[PDB]
Design a protein around this motif. Structure first.
Motif, mmCIF file in Angstrom:
data_model
loop_
_atom_site.group_PDB
_atom_site.id
_atom_site.type_symbol
_atom_site.label_atom_id
_atom_site.label_comp_id
_atom_site.label_asym_id
_atom_site.label_seq_id
_atom_site.Cartn_x
_atom_site.Cartn_y
_atom_site.Cartn_z
ATOM 1 N N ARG A 280 40.251 -51.013 53.482
ATOM 2 C CA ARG A 280 40.671 -50.424 54.761
ATOM 3 C C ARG A 280 40.802 -51.501 55.826
ATOM 4 N N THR A 281 41.961 -51.533 56.487
ATOM 5 C CA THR A 281 42.215 -52.520 57.537
ATOM 6 C C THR A 281 43.017 -51.829 58.636
ATOM 7 N N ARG B 233 53.650 -42.734 62.388
ATOM 8 C CA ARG B 233 52.849 -41.904 63.317
ATOM 9 C C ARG B 233 51.566 -41.385 62.704
ATOM 10 N N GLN B 234 51.589 -41.014 61.420
ATOM 11 C CA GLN B 234 50.479 -40.340 60.757
ATOM 12 C C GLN B 234 49.243 -41.232 60.707
ATOM 13 N N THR B 235 49.434 -42.527 60.741
ATOM 14 C CA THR B 235 48.339 -43.493 60.593
ATOM 15 C C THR B 235 48.173 -44.356 61.822
ATOM 16 N N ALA B 236 48.836 -44.006 62.935
ATOM 17 C CA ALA B 236 48.721 -44.785 64.175
ATOM 18 C C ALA B 236 47.298 -44.760 64.690
ATOM 19 N N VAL B 237 46.885 -45.890 65.237
ATOM 20 C CA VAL B 237 45.519 -46.019 65.777
ATOM 21 C C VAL B 237 45.402 -45.482 67.202
ATOM 22 N N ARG B 238 46.338 -45.802 68.079
ATOM 23 C CA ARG B 238 46.349 -45.396 69.469
ATOM 24 C C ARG B 238 47.775 -45.035 69.864
ATOM 25 N N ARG C 90 52.744 -47.932 57.357
ATOM 26 C CA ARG C 90 53.061 -48.730 58.579
ATOM 27 C C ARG C 90 54.546 -48.689 58.771
ATOM 28 N N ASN C 91 55.326 -49.400 57.952
ATOM 29 C CA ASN C 91 56.783 -49.266 57.979
ATOM 30 C C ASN C 91 57.351 -49.974 56.748
ATOM 31 N N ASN D 261 48.540 -49.680 62.861
ATOM 32 C CA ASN D 261 48.276 -48.684 61.858
ATOM 33 C C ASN D 261 46.989 -48.912 61.070
ATOM 34 N N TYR D 262 46.337 -47.774 60.785
ATOM 35 C CA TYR D 262 45.300 -47.760 59.753
ATOM 36 C C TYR D 262 45.960 -47.986 58.401
#
Ligand SMILES: [Cl-]
Length: 283
Positions: A70-71, A51-56, A255-256, A62-63
């Motif tokens: 950075r991707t 969740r902390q790095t989710a884009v939308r 991400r996971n 994920n960011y």
């Protein structure tokens, strides 16, 4: 004692296995983005989106920052997610979209992988035009087909996205280290050409680190995707001394825990690291 010998390899695998196991998602896990009001979010129920790095809020995306690189890593979008996915791609000023799901996967309607980048289409308010461009062999018969996707929406700036589609990298496998190097170079070069155009035009995105990120996905966005992102990070000169342990731990916490999904994919990262004299383990 080689730092790339069986004992270092076994130790790296033990550290990463513990991390995978403790990052596995609980039900309603506060660490992971949750579906809302019954609409499917995750293509695979247990391959979730930090969740902390989710884009939308409505994408499994994920960011990712590995060292300095950075991707965005995401799953193959669901059909219901295509408008949001194209909005992600346009707002990011995406300099390259690398798709590593195979043509066979996309064609199989049982998998629900919409053919969103090889043909034109309309998704809510967004219109997408696809154009086929060059084809580049990567070695061992592995082929990159390139496209330009032009994303239009009334009232919005039109954005075109270069696409690198590797159409014959099978799921749950690792292409060789040489193919991986060729792919990472093609993706980085594609991205740099497009980023350079934006900088030439004075785009505001150049100064925003949430934007101008290469977007990479496979089917789940954790196996083939992670092998490519690990190879891209090793091409970034800024990442001296970043270890394989660091790079995989960073992709997993961001991400996971499945990032770098197969041992053969980790082995390619290890081989590329050894080629650079890059450490496998911290300390
Ligand atoms: Cl989180």
């Amino acid at each position: 004692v080689s730092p790339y010998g069986p004992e270092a390899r076994a130790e790296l695998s033990s550290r990463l296995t513990t991390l995978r196991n403790t990052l596995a998602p609980a039900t309603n896990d506060p660490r992971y983005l949750q579906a809302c009001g019954g609409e499917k979010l995750n293509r695979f129920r247990d391959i979730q989106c930090r969740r902390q790095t989710a884009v939308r809020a409505d994408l499994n995306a994920n960011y990712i920052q590995v060292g300095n690189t950075r991707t965005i890593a995401c799953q193959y979008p669901l059909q219901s997610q295509l408008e949001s996915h194209f909005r992600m791609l346009a707002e990011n000023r995406t300099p390259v979209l690398a798709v590593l799901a195979s043509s066979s996967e996309i064609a199989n309607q049982r998998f629900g992988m919409p053919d969103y980048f090889r043909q034109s289409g309309t998704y809510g308010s967004i219109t997408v035009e696809s154009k086929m461009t060059q084809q580049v062999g990567l070695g061992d018969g592995i082929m990159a087909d390139m496209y330009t996707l032009t994303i239009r929406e009334a009232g919005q700036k039109t954005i075109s996205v270069p696409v690198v589609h590797v159409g014959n990298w099978p799921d749950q496998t690792a292409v060789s280290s040489e193919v991986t190097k060729a792919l990472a170079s093609l993706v980085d070069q594609t991205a740099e050409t497009k980023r350079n155009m934006y900088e030439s035009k004075g785009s505001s995105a150049v100064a925003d680190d949430s934007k101008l990120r290469p977007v990479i996905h496979s089917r789940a966005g954790v196996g083939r995707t992670a092998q490519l992102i690990g190879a891209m990070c090793m091409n970034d000169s800024r990442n001296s001394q970043l270890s394989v342990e660091d790079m995989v731990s960073q992709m997993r916490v961001q991400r996971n825990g499945i990032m770098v999904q197969k041992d053969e994919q980790l082995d390619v990262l290890i081989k590329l690291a050894e080629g650079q004299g890059r450490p496998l383990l911290n300390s």
